[PDB]
Subunit: 91 residues, 4 copies
């Protein structure tokens, strides 16, 4: 149920990002699949700032309003999900 | 409860960093909002050392005394706010 | 216990990656030992995308099909081993 | 107390490895390991896993190959203990 919620989340943000940054950043968001890849990378927190967001903000200042919240939501969910797997296996 | 304390901590360090490193590193610390961004990136641990702390230490060495503790504080509280919310449900 | 199967998982993927990407990326995959190093770094998530997967995808596109699953598998097992001590 | 004693064990482990690395890699990599304080900073960065491989270990291995035998274990140990201190709060709730 949570895994579905998250996938929905990725899907929504992937579509949004493609239409928001795909023009100026084809390598990372030009496609809905490219956006999926990039958003997953951001989720693992790998080079999200130095490698993706900071460069993005050089063209679209305040794009941080799309990514920091995305980071919060995605991190939070994953945290919970993990806890459940860990907690329930113990119980 | 942690959420507000954390916001306080971020605000303290952001104000501190702005006054401390904003002159030499305006791209990351020149503004109170720039310092907000940088300190969150450092909290996510994304290029905190190689990308931010090591460059800053070429100018103001031993600035790790601000950063490493900031890392402990924010890391520990986010560990705590996670466990706190999680154990409950 | 969890460590017993994860070791197997790493060995499978390492053998797979060596045969798949060792030709074009010998610095990271040319050896079975090299692929062991690379896959562990990818497991710790350090520069997996920008540093490893994205450059590999310029040669073999859709190689994320190996990596992203490898990432889920190895990340998942870590929590099952983290709790597998507790 | 352990938390505290485990935190004291960690401090010991960091001191061990920091002394080790200074003597092992400080010659060839003085910016990262030339000092006991430099090795302190580097080992903590490796602990938070930020550019540990691409940034530190991979470059060190071009000089002393198989120095991953120092690093990968150090990673295991410090990451495990920090998780031991994490669960030492998980059930301590």
């Amino acid at each position: 149920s949570v895994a579905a919620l998250l996938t929905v989340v990725f899907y929504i943000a992937a579509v949004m990002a493609t239409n928001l940054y795909g023009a100026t950043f084809p390598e990372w968001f030009g496609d809905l699949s490219k956006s999926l890849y990039t958003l997953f990378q951001v989720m693992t927190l790998e080079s999200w700032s130095m490698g993706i967001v900071r460069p993005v903000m050089n063209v679209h200042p305040n794009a941080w309003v799309f990514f920091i919240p995305f980071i919060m939501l995605t991190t939070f969910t994953v945290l919970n999900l993990f806890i459940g797997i860990i907690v329930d296996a113990m119980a």
